[PDB]
Design an enzyme around this catalytic site. Structure first.
Site, PDB file in Angstrom:
ATOM      1  N   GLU A   1       0.774  -1.251   0.000  1.00 35.68           N
ATOM      2  CA  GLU A   1       0.000   0.000   0.000  1.00 35.68           C
ATOM      3  C   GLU A   1       0.802   1.295   0.000  1.00 35.68           C
ATOM      4  O   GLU A   1       0.567   2.180   0.829  1.00 35.68           O
ATOM      5  CB  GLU A   1      -0.956   0.002   1.197  1.00 35.68           C
ATOM      6  CG  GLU A   1      -1.674  -1.327   1.363  1.00 35.68           C
ATOM      7  CD  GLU A   1      -2.683  -1.333   2.481  1.00 35.68           C
ATOM      8  OE1 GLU A   1      -2.597  -0.476   3.390  1.00 35.68           O
ATOM      9  OE2 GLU A   1      -3.559  -2.223   2.457  1.00 35.68           O
TER      10      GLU A   1
ATOM     11  N   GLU B   1      -5.609 -10.716  -1.863  1.00 35.83           N
ATOM     12  CA  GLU B   1      -6.467 -10.669  -0.674  1.00 35.83           C
ATOM     13  C   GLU B   1      -7.942 -10.559  -1.038  1.00 35.83           C
ATOM     14  O   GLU B   1      -8.683  -9.736  -0.495  1.00 35.83           O
ATOM     15  CB  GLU B   1      -6.055  -9.483   0.197  1.00 35.83           C
ATOM     16  CG  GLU B   1      -4.554  -9.409   0.481  1.00 35.83           C
ATOM     17  CD  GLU B   1      -4.195  -8.205   1.327  1.00 35.83           C
ATOM     18  OE1 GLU B   1      -5.119  -7.614   1.919  1.00 35.83           O
ATOM     19  OE2 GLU B   1      -3.004  -7.848   1.414  1.00 35.83           O
TER      20      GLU B   1
END
Ligand SMILES: O/N=C1\NC[C@@H](O[C@@H]2OC[C@@H](O)[C@H](O)[C@H]2O)[C@H](O)[C@H]1O
Length: 312
Positions: free
Chosen positions: A127, A233
């Site tokens: 991220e 994910e």
């Protein structure tokens, strides 16, 4: 095929799940983990807070448990995640300048070294970007070290583990947008300058009825930069409680996601962020949302199961 494991095995791809090692003592959880997946990733066991609670003091018990489960059951092992702004211990946030950079570099070296030869791929940096484009605005790494921390982490990781596939991971980058574009530029730059980088992980924390229509197209353009791609994910959250039409839409979404991967030769596979809605991370983070996984709270397969099976 009778299991998603066989389906994925047959497609020459991986189908994994995020493991909480403590749940292995729960019979039904283990039965599904053992039989329906061919890849495992630590949902939390290998993060910074779990591996280096105090500077220079490592605790690999939890991560080792996850690694052992993978080797013992013959599943591929994916590592999540070496450098991430979240779940970062205060002691690290309290450091600055060289001290901080040295702490990051050592954390990468120590963790990568510990699992060398066991973890096949690493989400080295997680991220790093911001929705809307540009770098993340609330990262200790971005604020203390600036733009170059990502390259530093990858070089440090490669030095510690010469063969592991090194990936950069992020969310809201499944379709072509300002955020995925910033990520695309980084990936291209790294390959051009020879910075170690072998893969890109598309988290895919989606909302049902909202799968990007250009998913495959986006996956393919990254693959074309000369790297592998992977859905890391996956979960598709709906407004709770669930009902028939929401579960059907979700099933359709899961099919669309697995399909996009199947349509890209370099998409290594799909990993769902958990097994059952009973433990899914969504409800506590997204108020009013949930029922995002393939198995419900009673370990009953949801419609999404057959969709994934058909997609592979
Ligand atoms: O979207 N990016 C991510 N999402 C899920 C993250 O995993 C969660 O992290 C917080 C913990 O409290 C939860 O148990 C866990 O599921 C993942 O690390 C991150 O990349």
């Amino acid at each position: 095929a009778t299991t998603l494991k066989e389906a994925a095995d047959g497609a020459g791809r991986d189908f994994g799940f995020a493991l909480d090692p403590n749940r292995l003592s729960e019979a039904q959880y283990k039965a599904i983990a053992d039989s329906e997946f061919n890849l495992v990733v630590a949902e939390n066991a290998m993060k910074w807070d779990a591996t280096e609670p105090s500077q220079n003091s490592f605790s690999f018990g939890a991560g080792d448990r996850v690694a052992s489960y993978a080797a013992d059951t013959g599943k591929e092992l994916y590592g999540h995640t070496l450098v991430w702004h979240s779940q970062l211990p205060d002691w690290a946030k309290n450091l600055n300048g060289s001290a901080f950079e040295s702490a990051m570099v050592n954390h990468v070296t120590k963790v990568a070294d510990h699992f060398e030869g066991k973890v096949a791929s690493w989400d080295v940096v997680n991220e790093a970007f911001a929705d809307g484009g540009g770098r993340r605005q609330d990262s200790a790494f971005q604020q203390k070290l600036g733009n170059g921390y990502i390259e530093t982490a990858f070089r440090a990781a490669r030095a510690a583990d010469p063969t592991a596939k090194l990936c950069i991971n992020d969310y809201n980058v499944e379709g072509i947008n300002a955020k995925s574009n910033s990520l695309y530029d980084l990936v291209k730059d790294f390959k051009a300058r020879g910075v170690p980088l072998d893969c890109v992980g598309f988290q895919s924390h989606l909302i049902v009825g909202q799968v990007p229509g250009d998913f495959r197209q986006n996956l393919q353009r990254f693959a074309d930069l000369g790297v592998d791609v992977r859905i890391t994910e996956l979960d598709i959250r709906m407004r709770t409680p669930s009902d028939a039409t929401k579960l059907a839409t979700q099933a359709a979404d899961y099919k669309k996601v697995v399909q996009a991967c199947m349509q890209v030769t370099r998409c290594q596979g799909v990993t769902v962020w958990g097994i059952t809605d009973k433990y899914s991370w969504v409800p506590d983070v997204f108020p009013g949302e949930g029922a995002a996984l393939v198995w419900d709270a009673s370990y009953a397969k949801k419609p999404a199961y057959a969709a994934v099976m058909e997609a592979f």
